[PDB]
Design a protein around this ligand. Structure first.
Ligand code: HEM
Ligand SMILES: CC[C@H]1OC(=O)C[C@@H](O)[C@H](C)[C@@H](O[C@@H]2O[C@H](C)[C@@H](O)[C@H](N(C)C)[C@H]2O)[C@@H](CC=O)C[C@@H](C)C(=O)/C=C/C(C)=C/[C@@H]1C
Length: 385
């Protein structure tokens, strides 16, 4: 009855049906472009239980698909295409680059990047596109430093990333992904030292990783690395511009910032609709999911679950702290989440200090939304300060 995907058409609020599903239909039967059956999971308790359940698979051969061409140029050793046990064996090689230890080590870089950017920006003028002139370059520079990827090629890989991450899109999306993967393959053939990509190249020379372990995850890290953080920064600024109380309170007490970052993550929920399939029959809440059925995890719905968050539709930096699923749940829970939280704290703290009188210069209804992207966001954010 319900089509999937449902377009996200409001920056600050997921689709209205999500509320009805959580209340009235928490394991909801829906249909893909070609009528294949999918289940929509909207409550936090069911999202977490199912995403952690060994009968739920991310394996690309049975994954629900959003068009006739979705599935073309699919990777084979990406973290996002591997089930246990392979998944953790591989993820184990990358975890040292993403722990608290390492993330705190990186924070001074991020602060310097952020400060240089805002120096230029304020010197040059009092207007800008916050995504193109600040969020995207911060996020790209950070991931370029971590991986050791030429920041100079940004034009190339940024436009491709953006096109490639539209899962229902036609040949433009597919050509972008093919070209994106050839870009990383060119960079890898060039090492054959520094950064995570140097380290991965080394481990593939020792017996340790395959070429596809290396390629597939370079693409994943580079794309997820910059697209998510750019969007989250942008969108987090947009939200704070609608909340002058919160803007002032965070400027005066930066100790509020770690908490506000979780509340922005929950509220915005830029990652939504994660896809899985069931490899066995699954009984949950009076329904039976059949082996082979598709599963869709409405993280944005679950992050507004009235059973978990009071006044869940309110953005509230003073709410009691509750765990959210903006980063997903189970074995594929965002590997970059410590880095992402640190980037956001740094970026937002700096914006508050350096641009205290920031204003938007276009209406909210006039922003262009990335509704068919896997990473929700806007195409630009015009501001003045
Ligand atoms: C800033 C906001 C970010 C959000 C909201 C976000 C959200 C997510 C979500 C929801 C997943 C799970 C996808 C699935 O289970 O199907 C995920 C996985 C991932 N994230 Fe992020 N992420 C962010 C930032 C980053 C950054 C900065 C990096 C890397 C530098 C990154 C690297 C990854 C990787 C490698 C995975 C796959 C992990 C696995 O399958 O084991 N993320 N992220
Ligand atoms: C919800 C945040 C999560 O987002 C995804 O994991 C999106 C991830 O599913 C793409 C959408 C997906 O793109 C789709 O890949 C298909 C095989 C293609 O057939 C399809 N066609 C249209 C080009 C392409 O769009 C990725 C390939 C599968 O992993 C794209 C590459 C660049 C990639 O690995 C991107 C990963 C990102 C952005 C992960 C963040 C954390």
């Amino acid at each position: 009855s319900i089509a999937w995907p449902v377009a996200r058409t409001c920056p600050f609020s997921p689709p209205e049906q999500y509320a009805a599903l959580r209340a009235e239909e928490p394991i909801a039967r829906a249909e893909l472009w070609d009528g294949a059956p999918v289940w929509l999971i909207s409550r936090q308790d069911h999202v977490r239980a199912l995403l952690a359940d060994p009968r739920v698979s991310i394996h690309p051969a049975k994954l629900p698909r959003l068009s006739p061409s979705d599935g073309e140029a699919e990777a084979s050793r990406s973290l996002l295409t591997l089930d246990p046990p392979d998944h953790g064996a591989l993820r184990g090689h990358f975890i040292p680059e993403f722990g608290l230890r390492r993330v705190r080590e990186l924070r001074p870089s991020v602060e310097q990047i952020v400060t240089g950017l805002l120096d230029d920006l304020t010197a040059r003028g009092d207007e800008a596109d916050l995504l193109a002139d600040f969020a995207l370059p911060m996020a790209t520079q950070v991931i370029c430093r971590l991986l050791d990827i030429p920041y100079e090629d940004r034009d190339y890989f940024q436009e491709r990333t953006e096109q490639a991450t539209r899962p229902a899109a036609g040949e433009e999306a597919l050509e972008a992904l093919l070209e994106l993967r050839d870009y990383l393959d060119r960079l890898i053939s060039g090492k054959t030292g520094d950064g995570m990509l140097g380290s991965m190249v080394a481990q593939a020379r020792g017996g340790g990783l395959s070429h596809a372990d290396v390629l597939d995850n370079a693409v994943l890290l580079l794309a997820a690395g910059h697209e998510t953080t750019a969007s989250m920064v942008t969108m987090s600024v947009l939200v704070l511009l609608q909340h002058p109380t919160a803007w002032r309170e965070l400027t005066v007490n930066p100790g509020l910032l770690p908490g506000a970052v979780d509340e922005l993550l929950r509220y915005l929920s830029i990652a939504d609709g994660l896809r899985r399939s069931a490899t066995a029959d699954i009984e949950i809440d009076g329904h039976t999911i059949r082996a082979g059925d598709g599963l869709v995890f409405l993280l944005a719905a679950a992050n507004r679950d009235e059973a978990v968050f009071s006044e869940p539709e309110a953005f509230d930096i003073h709410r009691s702290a509750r765990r959210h699923v903006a980063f997903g749940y189970g074995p594929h829970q965002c590997l970059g989440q410590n880095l992402a939280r640190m980037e956001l704290e740094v970026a937002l703290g700096a914006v508050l200090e350096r641009l205290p009188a920031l204003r938007p210069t276009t209406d909210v209804a006039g922003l262009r939304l990335k509704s068919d992207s896997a990473v929700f966001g806007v195409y630009e954010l015009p501001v003045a300060w």
